[PDB]
Amino acid sequence: SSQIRQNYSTEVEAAVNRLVNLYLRASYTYLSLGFYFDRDDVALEGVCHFFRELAEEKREGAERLLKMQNQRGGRALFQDLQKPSQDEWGTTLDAMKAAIVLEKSLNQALLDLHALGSAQADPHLCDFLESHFLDEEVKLIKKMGDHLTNIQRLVGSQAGLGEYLFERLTLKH
Amino acid sequence: SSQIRQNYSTEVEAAVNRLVNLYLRASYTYLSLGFYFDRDDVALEGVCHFFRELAEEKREGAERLLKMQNQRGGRALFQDLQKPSQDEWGTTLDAMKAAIVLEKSLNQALLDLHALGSAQADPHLCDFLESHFLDEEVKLIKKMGDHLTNIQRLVGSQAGLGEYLFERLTLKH
Amino acid sequence: SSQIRQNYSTEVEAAVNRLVNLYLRASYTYLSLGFYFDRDDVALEGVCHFFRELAEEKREGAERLLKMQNQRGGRALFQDLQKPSQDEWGTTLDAMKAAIVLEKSLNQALLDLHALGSAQADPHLCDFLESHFLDEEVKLIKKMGDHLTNIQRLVGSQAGLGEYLFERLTLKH
Amino acid sequence: SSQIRQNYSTEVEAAVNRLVNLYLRASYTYLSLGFYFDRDDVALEGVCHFFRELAEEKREGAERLLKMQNQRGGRALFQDLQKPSQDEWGTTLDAMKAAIVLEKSLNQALLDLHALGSAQADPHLCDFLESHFLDEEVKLIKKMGDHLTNIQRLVGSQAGLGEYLFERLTLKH
Numbered sequence: 001s002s003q004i005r006q007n008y009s010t011e012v013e014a015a016v017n018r019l020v021n022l023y024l025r026a027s028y029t030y031l032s033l034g035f036y037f038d039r040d041d042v043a044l045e046g047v048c049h050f051f052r053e054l055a056e057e058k059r060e061g062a063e064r065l066l067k068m069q070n071q072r073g074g075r076a077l078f079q080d081l082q083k084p085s086q087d088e089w090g091t092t093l094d095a096m097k098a099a100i101v102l103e104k105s106l107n108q109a110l111l112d113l114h115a116l117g118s119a120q121a122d123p124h125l126c127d128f129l130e131s132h133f134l135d136e137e138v139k140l141i142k143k144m145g146d147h148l149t150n151i152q153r154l155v156g157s158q159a160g161l162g163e164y165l166f167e168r169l170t171l172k173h
Numbered sequence: 174s175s176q177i178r179q180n181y182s183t184e185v186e187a188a189v190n191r192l193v194n195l196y197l198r199a200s201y202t203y204l205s206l207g208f209y210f211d212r213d214d215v216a217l218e219g220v221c222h223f224f225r226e227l228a229e230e231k232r233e234g235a236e237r238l239l240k241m242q243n244q245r246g247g248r249a250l251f252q253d254l255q256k257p258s259q260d261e262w263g264t265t266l267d268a269m270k271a272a273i274v275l276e277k278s279l280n281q282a283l284l285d286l287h288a289l290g291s292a293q294a295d296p297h298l299c300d301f302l303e304s305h306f307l308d309e310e311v312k313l314i315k316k317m318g319d320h321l322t323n324i325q326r327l328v329g330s331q332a333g334l335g336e337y338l339f340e341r342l343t344l345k346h
Numbered sequence: 347s348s349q350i351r352q353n354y355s356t357e358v359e360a361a362v363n364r365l366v367n368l369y370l371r372a373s374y375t376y377l378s379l380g381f382y383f384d385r386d387d388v389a390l391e392g393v394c395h396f397f398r399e400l401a402e403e404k405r406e407g408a409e410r411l412l413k414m415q416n417q418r419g420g421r422a423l424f425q426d427l428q429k430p431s432q433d434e435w436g437t438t439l440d441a442m443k444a445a446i447v448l449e450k451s452l453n454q455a456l457l458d459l460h461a462l463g464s465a466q467a468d469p470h471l472c473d474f475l476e477s478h479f480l481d482e483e484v485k486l487i488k489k490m491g492d493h494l495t496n497i498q499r500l501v502g503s504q505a506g507l508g509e510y511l512f513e514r515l516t517l518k519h
Numbered sequence: 520s521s522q523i524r525q526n527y528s529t530e531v532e533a534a535v536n537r538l539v540n541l542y543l544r545a546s547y548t549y550l551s552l553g554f555y556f557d558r559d560d561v562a563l564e565g566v567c568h569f570f571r572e573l574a575e576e577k578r579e580g581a582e583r584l585l586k587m588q589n590q591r592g593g594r595a596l597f598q599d600l601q602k603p604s605q606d607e608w609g610t611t612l613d614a615m616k617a618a619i620v621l622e623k624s625l626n627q628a629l630l631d632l633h634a635l636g637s638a639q640a641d642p643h644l645c646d647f648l649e650s651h652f653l654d655e656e657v658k659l660i661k662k663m664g665d666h667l668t669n670i671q672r673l674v675g676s677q678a679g680l681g682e683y684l685f686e687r688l689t690l691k692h
């Protein structure tokens with residue numbers, strides 16, 4: 001058992017474990033999104049790359065939470081990981097809408113844990129989220145919003161042409 | 174009071190202060206244009222960058238006028254700065270039309286001050302405008318005209334697609 | 347309209363627009379202070395430089411707020427900018443007193459927005475101010491206080507001599 | 520005789536010769552000022568250097584006028600050079616006042632030649648003065664005005680101390 005734990009509530013400890021699960025679920029969703037866009041009948045390499053990168057980012061977020069759990073003397077507990085919500089993800093527009101919904105759900109979980117930390121007077125937890133998660137999440141959601149607007153502008157007419165152009169001229173590939 | 178002032182009319186001194194106001198107003202207009210194109214629901218980064226760069230250029234023009242005012246022994250006087258004429262700027266085409274109108278108004282103010290300087294036999298003022306402002310303004314207006322033509326060619330059909338292509342393939346981003 | 351806005355109150359959105367106005371007003375005040383010290387009948391280059399640098403810093407603060415407004419899905423709205431409170435700024439001592447008063451007013455606006463963000467449970471806003479504004483402001487006010495003390499020590503007797511020495515041996519020039 | 524002269528009036532030709540005389544007279548005045556401040560009983564090295572540099576600058580201005588006279592097919596004619604107006608130049612304040620008076624007289628001669636060139640429709644002459652003389656003269660007069668203000672601030676009380684400090688901390692030495 002821990003000899004280090006101080007000012008670290010059981011409520012926070014549990015919520016951190018739940019948030020690890022949510023990040024790993026998000027990572028898995030992005031893995032599925034990435035490989036869908038690598039299908040020969042979809043074949044949008046830049047979109048594939050975008051989602052593969054996000055799978056890595058979310059895995060890293062979970063690892064940072066687990067590191068923090070140990071630094072505070074909490075105990076990591078892992079649960080089953082639910083499969084992603086879809087097996088096929090539609091168009092780039094459909095996929096980017098699904099990604100924004102996912103990110104808003106993660107952001108809300110961050111905000112809820114921040115509020116719990118505030119209520120429990122756990123400034124280390126609050127700072128940790130502020131420093132490593134909240135701004136990263138706002139920046140990502142802004143980037144996704146920008147992408148959504150551009151995809152919408154392009155597929156309004158000539159959907160196929162528009163989807164190709166976005167992948168070629170906006171996304172990294 | 175000044176021990177240096179020579180051949181520097183009160184009329185020119187006042188007109189220079191007015192021109193500083195007009196440049197700072199233009200800078201502010203460009204700031205608003207730049208941030209409008211950074212909105213998540215507009216999201217045209219190259220257009221944002223173009224107008225942000227012009228905000229800087231116009232601020233620098235005002236600073237050069239203020240430096241000159243002091244070099245001649247005139248006295249800088251600042252007035253309120255009017256907010257820009259719009260809060261939302263429409264499409265890239267709408268924005269570039271508004272920018273050309275603005276630039277023509279600045280160019281006319283330059284020409285009017287040049288004529289005043291000529292009438293007052295103030296060759297330093299005339300040279301100063303020739304050397305630092307008049308050609309810069311002609312070059313800018315030509316660039317904006319070129320852009321306008323290209324945007325017009327593109328949005329004639331497929332307005333969304335055209336606006337994206339211009340931002341991606343003409344503007345710096 | 348925004349597809350990204352989350353946990354971002356209308357009250358905060360408005361207060362951020364007001365704070366942009368206050369920063370741009372401060373920038374304008376510093377521009378006037380800088381050019382006053384460049385007058386041939388004032389001629390304190392280090393003092394000019396000090397205030398010109400602050401005009402840039404305050405403009406950059408406003409730009410960071412506007413960037414943040416867009417990242418959160420708020421809408422930038424610009425108002426008229428009031429001219430500075432004086433047309434002539436007196437001695438270096440008078441100017442540095444006026445600057446401290448200005449900075450304390452900006453600091454109070456930061457603190458008030460922080461308190462609003464706390465009350466609205468907007469940790470991203472609170473963190474943003476903590477990370478980019480509050481410490482910068484404390485450091486600046488301390489520097490100005492240090493300067494004020496040194497100027498006071500010097501102009502107690504031999505005001506002209508003291509003002510020259512401060513400009514030459516403390517300020518950057 | 521010239522095979523090249525075109526659009527170059529006898530009036531301009533003569534006035535250019537007179538202006539060469541005035542520049543060489545100014546150069547000679549600065550030579551005397553420079554060596555006065557090198558006296559063992561004056562001994563202000565930075566002031567000496569300042570005026571020696573101006574003697575060179577004025578000689579170079581005369582050489583540029585003579586080059587231009589030949590480029591236009593006019594004929595250089597030299598007259599006697601009057602000695603400087605004083606044999607001893609007083610304090611740094613006295614000397615810098617005398618220098619500003621001299622420079623204003625040169626500036627007025629430039630402006631008068633510009634007006635003659637305008638009246639004679641000689642744009643090459645007008646451009647030549649604009650490009651090589653008028654702005655240089657405005658910048659110099661501003662620098663001298665700045666110096667005068669600083670010297671005045673310093674010698675108001677403790678004249679000896681003030682004169683030393685100006686030489687040590689403003690002038691190049």
Ligand SMILES: [Cl-]
Pocket residue numbers: 080
């Ligand atoms: Cl199980």
Ligand SMILES: [Cl-]
Pocket residue numbers: 253429
């Ligand atoms: Cl007013």
Ligand SMILES: [Cl-]
Pocket residue numbers: 256426
């Ligand atoms: Cl209004």
Ligand SMILES: [Cl-]
Pocket residue numbers: 599
């Ligand atoms: Cl003779």
